[PDB]
Assembly symmetry: C2
Homo-oligomer: 251 residues x 2
């Protein structure tokens, strides 16, 4: 199943998306009501209203073989404000002064139940599903501030979507980022330094996680700049593709 | 005017708090504390209810270094605390078993009153509901280790807020004081802020949209220090009152 939010002519609905052909249907909601919008008629929004967004930075091994092996250091987690969230096909707006601003394609965990102190092995019990995220980052501000929050916290700097997949096996799916059709990031989640359960364990040991909260699981190598007029597309195997145009704000 | 949130026999309510003696009264404000307040006509004695965190912030922004001793300051460094860290007056700060030391950091807190973005420092007060007190509780060992300060300052209960929001306060030059078990740890005045309230609202709203209820912690003076199981921490701001929390180690 794929869960998400859509903008209809009747308004906003939380829907179930079913079908891979453009004869695709969004059915409203789980108890279904009966109203059906084709996917063609409506527009996908960010699939959930997150109270907070937690992200990790360094979380991909370079290659499977190294290592392995020796335990990775503990995760470093941080927050992006939920005001940064935008959905598919919404422009990423670059600050006039921010150079360079980087794309960071990531697999996103969506929490489905309130939780605290969850053991890594039980993480799936509290996970609604998986979607795609982009941890857009003003790299200059990162270096100036030390704290990464401002750099990653601007409005539109957290694209999320296109929908939430509830039955995905996210253990070994391909993640890739394209800029204007050009592949710039490519890895598999089998190379996650801290896997999904470890991240949920680490994060819920720190703070209460609420239904809707998002945990971005990190980005592999290849992070690179995005400029006015670019299109960034992040594809996760078994989920789909999150696409956003890019515009720079005037001075 | 003092605006708070209370737990009453009738549920949770926003209130105007009136009086300082034993017969203080809480006057119910309809739905939220933001516009011109609408009084329902319902009220409770303060003695009959319990003050909660005065606002349900969608987010909490904070700054690190922001008081002069008594050099030109570097630009503000802001970060986030999750709103799941917020607790109200008298609620125990719960220390993680493995965190040492954990420090108190008494601060003046801005509460945003209107949605906004790209606010000029000069006009910040037009967008500010009022001022309350905060404690930016920080696990120092985690802070140093992580580089990023979020985890160190993001544990459940690591953001005491309260006891209420004062709407007609001139915060230009008020005393800020932190006591632990009756001993003064921190004491300074807001006239020593490196980045004043205006500069912080300007800086933060240039980055992100702020919502009514959002909180900006304006930093802490010298004298930060450890808290431990059994301690009581009290932060006082002249013109607001005192935010007090006991401390327990898990
Ligand atoms: Na004001
Ligand atoms: Na602080």
């Amino acid at each position: 199943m794929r869960l998400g939010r859509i903008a209809s002519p009747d308004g906003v609905a939380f829907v179930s998306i079913e079908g891979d052909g453009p004869d695709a249907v969004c059915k409203e909601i789980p108890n279904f009501t009966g109203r059906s919008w084709p996917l063609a008629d409506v527009r996908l929004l960010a699939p959930i209203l997150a109270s907070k967004v937690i992200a990790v930075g360094k979380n991909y091994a370079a290659h499977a073989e190294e290592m392995g092996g020796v335990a990775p250091e503990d995760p470093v987690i941080f927050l992006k404000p939920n005001t940064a969230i935008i959905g598919p096909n919404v422009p990423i707006q670059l600050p006039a002064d921010a150079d360079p601003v980087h794309h960071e394609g990531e697999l996103a965990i969506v929490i489905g139940r309130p939780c605290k102190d969850v053991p890594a092995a039980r993480a799936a019990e509290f996970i609604l599903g998986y979607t795609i995220g982009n941890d857009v980052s003003a790299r200059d501000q990162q270096r100036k501030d030390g704290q990464w929050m401002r750099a990653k916290g601007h409005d539109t700097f957290c694209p999320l979507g296109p929908w939430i997949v509830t039955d995905l096996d996210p253990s070994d799916v391909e993640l890739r980022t394209e800029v204007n059709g050009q592949v710039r990031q490519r890895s598999r989640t089998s190379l996650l330094l801290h896997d999904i359960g470890r991240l949920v364990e680490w994060t819920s040991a720190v703070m209460t996680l609420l239904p809707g909260d998002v945990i971005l699981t990190g980005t592999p190598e290849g992070v690179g700049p995005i400029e006015d007029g670019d299109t960034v597309s992040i594809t996760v195997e078994g989920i789909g593709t999150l696409t956003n145009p890019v515009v720079r704000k005037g001075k």
